[PDB]
Amino acid sequence: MDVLYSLSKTLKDARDKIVEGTLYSNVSDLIQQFNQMIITMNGNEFQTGGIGNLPIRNWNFNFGLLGTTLLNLDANYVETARNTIDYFVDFVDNVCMDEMVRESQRNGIAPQSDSLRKLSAIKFKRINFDNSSEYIENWNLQNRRQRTGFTFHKPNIFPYSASFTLNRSQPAHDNLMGTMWLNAGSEIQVAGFDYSCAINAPANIQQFEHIVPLRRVLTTATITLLPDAERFSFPRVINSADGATTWFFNPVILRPNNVEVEFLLNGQIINTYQARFGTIVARNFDTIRLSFQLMRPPNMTPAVAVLFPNAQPFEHHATVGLTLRIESAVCESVLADASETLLANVTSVRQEYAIPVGPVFPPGMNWTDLITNYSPSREDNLQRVFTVASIRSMLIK
């Protein structure tokens, strides 16, 4: 692994640092890096590719030492070098690819494709520059059994879930009361709905309590909370509890009350916020419980009194709505993130060549069905492939 990112960084600095006219002093360490590497490469022969329909490639390391140059090197060396550089980037691209599609229920935090295992031999230890990007550093830290870190702009952690619970339900469905929630992407939209507007609940107050569990634990998150749900506030026709008929829903939305947001971890109240809207901060949690109250209007105006008679026939139903968007977060484990395309690069290199997907990943790299069945083993596999994909990004856009 370490070999991979070391060589990728040295090839990147090669592609980006050899331009005509620089002092010979800004490049001396670089050319000596390259020379050490190639000296190690003189003698190595490699065979790779061939799982799926991937091509079989044979690589032969036969080039001599780079050219020693004057004060300011000239374009001849540039061309001679970048030729072998093209060949080297081809090699490493096919390397990342051959590594990208392999999976195993057992170990596999470590390399699995035998080519990298050859790279795992002590003979390739001399070839190593450093690590500068995050993921390799968290790799080495997990190699040290310590804490890790990953900063996501809108992390994607929620499992696709459009589902509702029933409290007051009739086989005819015109006296409903309950709570309907949409979990999706990096968003949660909950809505507590009632048809009688709490005429029979004491104090003209109806309680709602809802709880979302996540599969992995986040850290130090920033979360925006807006007090009107923006997905459930319009009329709808909704399927049945048995999946065999349909009912109607005409909404009216009010400001909620007793909006109480708790960030929990194993039965301990880690954070609690009362009626605070806008962006909030949470120090450490893995589950979120929302509690709120739908209050019958203490007084009402003539237009309103047509909204909640004390009778049974109803043509508008009340609802409070709450939307929650995790703007940015930090996680210790590896999660597919918004800004980077690491998930995207992985799935693209998985699909583009019709590779029959592994025995533990989902069919076709479906991500939400994956996190629904997200395991520690799957966590680690995704971690390694994300590592190698971030490597791939380094040399081929």
Next chain:
Amino acid sequence: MDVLYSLSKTLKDARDKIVEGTLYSNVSDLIQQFNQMIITMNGNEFQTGGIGNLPIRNWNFNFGLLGTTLLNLDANYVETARNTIDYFVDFVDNVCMDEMVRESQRNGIAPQSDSLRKLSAIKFKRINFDNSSEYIENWNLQNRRQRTGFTFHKPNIFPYSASFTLNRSQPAHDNLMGTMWLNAGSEIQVAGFDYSCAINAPANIQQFEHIVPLRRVLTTATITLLPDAERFSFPRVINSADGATTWFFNPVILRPNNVEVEFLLNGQIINTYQARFGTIVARNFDTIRLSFQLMRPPNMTPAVAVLFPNAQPFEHHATVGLTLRIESAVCESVLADASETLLANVTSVRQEYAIPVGPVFPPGMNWTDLITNYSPSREDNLQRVFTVASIRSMLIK
């Protein structure tokens, strides 16, 4: 202040560069820098803690140096290194916790923790390794009395407020005309509503001009202007200005025509756009003025002409809506953003060890309360906290 970033960037260089496998000429000058730092530290003593649950810690300096004879790195090297690095990261983090929870009524340009107080002393200035980070560069060139910049994505700069203006109000609240707005995060949703639908107004036209002042100077605003008002397009039971009554609102949207926008700077026309949608740019402004007309369709269709009769009663009320979203900007004062965590980190570290609410920050790091009543003194103190939060973010995760 610079001294601390120098220390921590060097500590980052240690964490990143001295890992078995490097040629010594690749770290040589780094090694000299690190030994110079450690020398400069031998000869002083520090004390920390002393407010909130933050404990006092007494820090000494009597250390050993790292070898400079190595040609290729061995493990015992980085072992003895991490030995000292543990102490140094503990020290820098303790310094951060200490200073983050301090204040000054004015002149917040200076730290108030004994640590930095003695730490900016003359005998310490030898360690100015570099100013690689962005915020430290801003801080430096600020010391030199110069113009700066910071590039933020979807910052939270608008003052949060959920309120509404009526221009024609009747107590019974069955014939009303006015303007509604919502300003939060980087969103402004603004709408104008008419019950007469401008059937009695001169020229079959209604005008709304809405003025949103920005509290801090912006530069290079990329905005999206879109013809909807999403949160303002569904029935509502709103409290009136009575503080004792409640009124009804059922909207329908017409096309907001002659939509004209003016981005002003201290009161001079700077950017002025007219009947243009999608993406838009403003260069340098401090307030926004939105002028738009509402117009009754001179042509109709039966289903239309029923809802908008020539009489005074009214059941549907016309409304025009505009959406303004500020995607990314460059600012000249420190701001809370949608892509970093400084605000979050500082709020966390304040709440953690029971910091009694001091005499400067508004209570509870309520960002909206802070921004709505912005002040130069407070922006100074927040600049301090954000630079040092960035400092902290480098080492500890």
Next chain:
Amino acid sequence: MDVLYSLSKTLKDARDKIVEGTLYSNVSDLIQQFNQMIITMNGNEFQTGGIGNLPIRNWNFNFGLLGTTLLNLDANYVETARNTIDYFVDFVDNVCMDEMVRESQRNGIAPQSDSLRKLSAIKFKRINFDNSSEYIENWNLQNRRQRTGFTFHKPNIFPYSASFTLNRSQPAHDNLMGTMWLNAGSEIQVAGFDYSCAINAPANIQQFEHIVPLRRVLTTATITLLPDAERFSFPRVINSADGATTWFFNPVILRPNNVEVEFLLNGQIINTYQARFGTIVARNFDTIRLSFQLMRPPNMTPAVAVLFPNAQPFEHHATVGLTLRIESAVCESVLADASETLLANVTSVRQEYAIPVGPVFPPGMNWTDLITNYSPSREDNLQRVFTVASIRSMLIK
């Protein structure tokens, strides 16, 4: 162009690193390269301005040689350095701005300002630092014709185009069957709507088919798909084709059934998604097709029959929508975004000095008018001005 990025990074490194106190070898190389820049640039006139109302300045270079004989840094050295770098940054930004508002129709990547035209002479190609950042990296690369790439978050690819089409029409507009959509920024929201709910069509399912064609082949994009018309969910009063009649559309929402999204390229089908929701990844596409079915419920409980009378007079209409957001990607051409600041600077610097519009660029750099007619010459001119904007973007933010 490379000489401009050279000078830019020269000045940026001089602004951040060299301050009094550090170790000399830590800056010595940088000082040597800066001094060579000086030695070679002194003794040549540079005439900026000479079009429009932008000021017409002259530039002369005779700055001395900053000392390399020191080992530790004195206040006077950095004093001179700042006094000189002020001059230099003013020069670089003025020449940048001048190159900004120039164009051509032939050789759209060629130098256009007299300063740069003089400067790209080979006797200034002996001072070039590196190519570190992204935009000049891609410029140099596409000059050598390897594969290209720019990383975009929220790539505003489509124009704004609020259009709709009718499949079954009426002169009274009371039996509409068709589609509406809003496509702009990064977002697409397309909805298919019906009035008779397939009470005449075979099998009680109504088909809708919709296309969106792109103008550049994107690459490796994550896309979120959500099952709703998030901007077509409220009663509407809309013009007909010739704008002589206004029709009334009052929606009710169902689920979209047999949702079939197809990413097509080059007259071939590339990738599919059927009944998968939430986030997805697509490798390589230039056209999106959305084929979706609207189904009638088989059973209806008391609430529904009023929503759908089996006879021809209808009040409430059924509709199903799709929301499609391309989260992030990498483009092989240049585009704007919501997370960078290139477009804004381009537009501002063009807006200020009242430059007479050129024969090639569209007025006001109107982005949507550009995208509707993306032509290769304009593209290469974009790329040029965006590299120049990045250059400016490191020097005076």
Next chain:
Amino acid sequence: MDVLYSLSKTLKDARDKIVEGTLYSNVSDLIQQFNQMIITMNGNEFQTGGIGNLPIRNWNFNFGLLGTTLLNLDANYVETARNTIDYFVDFVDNVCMDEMVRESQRNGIAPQSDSLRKLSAIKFKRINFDNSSEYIENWNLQNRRQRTGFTFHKPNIFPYSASFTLNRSQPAHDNLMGTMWLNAGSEIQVAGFDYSCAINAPANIQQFEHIVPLRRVLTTATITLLPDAERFSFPRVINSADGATTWFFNPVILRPNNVEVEFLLNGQIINTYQARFGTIVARNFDTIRLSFQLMRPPNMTPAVAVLFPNAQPFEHHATVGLTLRIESAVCESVLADASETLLANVTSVRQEYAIPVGPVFPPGMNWTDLITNYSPSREDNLQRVFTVASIRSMLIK
């Protein structure tokens, strides 16, 4: 790639220059390059054939160097060269073809033959006599990032589509109004027709529009414009749109008035011409609009008043039209003219060697489908094939 053009021209110069009797000084360059070639080409083997019907042929190089100390040439020397010339020209031909057949979905500007793939190495870069033909030059220019240029005589840029359009239709065709137009080869002929001769219409004027977009912009066009439709001037029997019956056409020609031809660029007027025929010029255009008004004549001799009876039954039909012809042009891409055998030769050889259809070239080289969806990858492969075919052309006959 370059090496193949070099070799072809080299052998061409051999064929045209190396003839008995001359001064060896006259051929110095030629024999110098030839000996360089044989220096490079010994010690290696090349393979072709296998794909399609091309038989696998192996090729070697063992010929010895050629004399230089002569004074005047003898046919002995000539055939001494010619026996090698034959082998080499045949090998050139075969490599040309084995490249010609090849096509792939990705990266098509590069070659696809392992022959050319081996040719790309440094060992072959010694070989170059000259690059002075037009197509290799445009090649090297689209390599050097300069404005490319392809001159053409009578280009076949308009795709083939002969269809008509109606504005008013009777199921029996006793009352019509519409247009016909055929755009073939390099010319277009449009003709708008009415049966009423616009008697009922307002102010005795009937408008006609017709637009044509091109899939590749042109430059410095010298267009010819003749007002007529010789192709639509004789009584026709034409098939309806649905396909069950036909309709009649007996038109009578008038001359069109206020003929406006508008050559627009990206929705910007560049050339506009009214009240004028003959040869006109367009500097930079890609979108042609022909708009013309038919005016019912002012006053008519009785034989004419018989033609257009003011009552409803029509016994003759009115028509006015235009013809636009492209003689010479200049473009950014590759095109099909009426004076080059590139398109001819490539189609012919693909047929003769009977290559199956591949996913880039549509079946049967039908230039219609070729130019219908002209797009990047197709363009690149077409440039490649035209280039290599031109390479072939000078020698094959």
Next chain:
Amino acid sequence: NLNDNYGISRQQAFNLLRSDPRVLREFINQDNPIIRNRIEQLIMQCRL
């Protein structure tokens, strides 16, 4: 708007400030959407 996004020369400008027909008409003939939109604003603001 006009001076910003359309770069009229000083001559055209001083004509405008006079409300000079030459420049207004030639600009409409060049179809700047801004000028036509202003004149349409004026037209519509006539509500007899």
